[PDB]
């Protein structure tokens, strides 16, 4: 994969960030939140 557009390193870094880092972080935070036995 490559790109002739400006800042072609940005899909290179952001496709794993939006595909792996963002959903793993979001589901981890949501899993910790929806099982929180804090008050109710």
């Amino acid at each position: 994969m490559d790109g002739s557009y400006a800042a072609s390193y940005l899909p290179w870094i952001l496709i794993p960030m939006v595909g792996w880092l963002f959903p793993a972080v979001t589901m981890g935070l949501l899993f910790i939140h929806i099982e929180s036995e804090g008050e109710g």
Partner: protein, 31 residues
Amino acid sequence: MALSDTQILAALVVALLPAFLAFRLSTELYK
């Protein structure tokens, strides 16, 4: 003509502002 790298990075720096504002609105709507 095509855009520049600095244009794209400046747009992402701009997009940091509605990200923070959406965080604030979702936090305020949560309570």
